[PDB]
Structure 1
Amino acid sequence: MNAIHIGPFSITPAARGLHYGGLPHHQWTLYYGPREMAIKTLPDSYTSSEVRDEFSDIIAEFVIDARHRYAPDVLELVNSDGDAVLARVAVSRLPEALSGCIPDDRFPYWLLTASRPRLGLPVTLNEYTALAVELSAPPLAWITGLLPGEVLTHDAEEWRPPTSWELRHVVGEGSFTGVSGAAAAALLGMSATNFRKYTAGDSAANRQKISFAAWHYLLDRLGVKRAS
């Protein structure tokens, strides 16, 4: 039938068909871009919303694995012993002055990492809050692991605009954020027709590229980056 596109995923059918049993059948192939994840032979009587439900569990497992393997580093605020965790914050990057540390009594508050070779830094509550404000991680910061490092960089000379498939990771009905194109356009203060030109694929007539400020502001508003 038709190739079902769910965000960065694309379920394309086989051009030829087969007859498993007596009923008509086709091979549906799940794709994550150029990566093939599954082939499932399905009847032709299924609707698109039912093949979507058939392939939904593999997509859910992929999203769980992506969220787990790209989780931001967690910092821990502890007392002068290191046993009780008073507050924990997930950070996009570690503090600059972290070194290998074991808490002692001369300082009341210590900011240690969650990794077992715990780096640390003696802080007060005011400096801890300054570091937490500066270094905090957005709730959907795990999607940055699925994106290239040259589309997320803040250096304008080394920045490359995201493609349509890399843009489907963060905007779209079946995206990893779950926001529609109209909602993304409303977040950028532009028309939905212009954003559809950003998300347009294979239509070489009137296809546009997103800009540096628009891309980084969209990543700010969706909760993916720059939301410390």
Structure 2
Amino acid sequence: MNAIHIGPFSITPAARGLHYGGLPHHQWTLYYGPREMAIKTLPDSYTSSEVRDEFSDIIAEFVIDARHRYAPDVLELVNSDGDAVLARVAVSRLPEALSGDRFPYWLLTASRPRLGLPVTLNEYTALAVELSAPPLAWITGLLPGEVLTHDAEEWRPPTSWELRHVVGEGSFTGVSGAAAAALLGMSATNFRKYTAGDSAANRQKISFAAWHYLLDRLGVKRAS
């Protein structure tokens, strides 16, 4: 009857069980941090991974909701007075020269309010290199800004709960602790001092530079 952890998710059994149809069950609750997500009444004869699996659909649609809810803005390349979209690019930040003929392409916002700027192809290229969003940028939709900021005066190290958004096989990147450690050039043992049940008594937290470098290597947030 031990509680189960899938990255930042938690499935816990209630303190006392119950009989249902003469057999012992327990109600298990799915938690995303403090948010209660789902309740299911499960036979005690269920293994741990039987409990775990019964909730993996509700988790999957959470992810789906988050990939959409936090998807980056998208820019569109069209011919100057052309008629089709020639390319699209997701961008984690908008170009500062956007508003309402020497140039042969327009870079357009894919959503209203429509902002545009005229660009040569080399200009479009430089912009996309600079601004392109990385594959898992939507995970930043779930982390607090104190953790994401490059302002060393306001930066707060992530908690193990926040770290588990991005490392751990049940995390939203799927990338395990041991792989994460190698990215940072540390031992698996040393990196796991940051993500543990007892990590509150581990005085060494992840460094500002390691964390932002990590988020880049995992494809969550460009170091720029």
TM interval, short-chain normalised? over 0.9
Note the alpha carbon deviations across 1:69-108, whole angstroms, 9 max, x for none.
00000000001225310111000000001012xxxx6532
- The size of the alignment, in residue pairs, is 224
- For normalisation by structure 1, the TM-score amounts to 0.95
Give the drift of 1:52.
1.1
Unaligned runs of 5+ in 1: none
Q: Tell me, which stretches of 5 or more residues in structure 2 are unaligned?
A: none
Distance in 1 separating the partners of 2:82 and 2:135:
27
Give the Cα–Cα distance (whole angstroms) in 2 for the partners of residues 54 and 122 of structure 1: 52
Q: CA deviation at 1:205?
A: 3.7
Q: Against the structure 1 CA distance between its residues 94 and 82, is the aligned structure 2 distance closer, same or farther, given a 3 Å change threshold? A: farther
Q: TM-score, normalised by structure 2?
A: 0.96
Question: Is the deviation greater in 1-10 or in 107-116?
Answer: 107-116
Distance 2:159 2:202 in 1: 15
Q: Deviations over 1:107-151 (max 9, x none)?
A: 320000001332000110111101101101000000000000111
Q: How far, CA to CA, are the matches of 2:141 and 2:168 in structure 1?
A: 18
- For the Cα contact (< 8 Å) 1:172–1:180, is it kept in 2? yes
Distance 1:140 1:19 in 2: 44
| Structure 1 residues 224 and 113: CA distance shift in structure 2, 3 A | same
Q: Indicate the larger mover: 208-217 or 197-206.
A: 197-206
Q: SS at 2:192's partner residue?
A: helix
- In structure 2, the residue corresponding to 1:66 is in which secondary structure? helix
Identity %: 100
- Structure 1 residue runs of 4 or more that deviate by more than 6 Å after TM superposition: none
SS in 1 for 2:200: coil
- Distance change (3 Å), C-alpha of 1:184 and 1:74: same
8 Å CA contact 2:160, 2:199 repeated in 1 = no
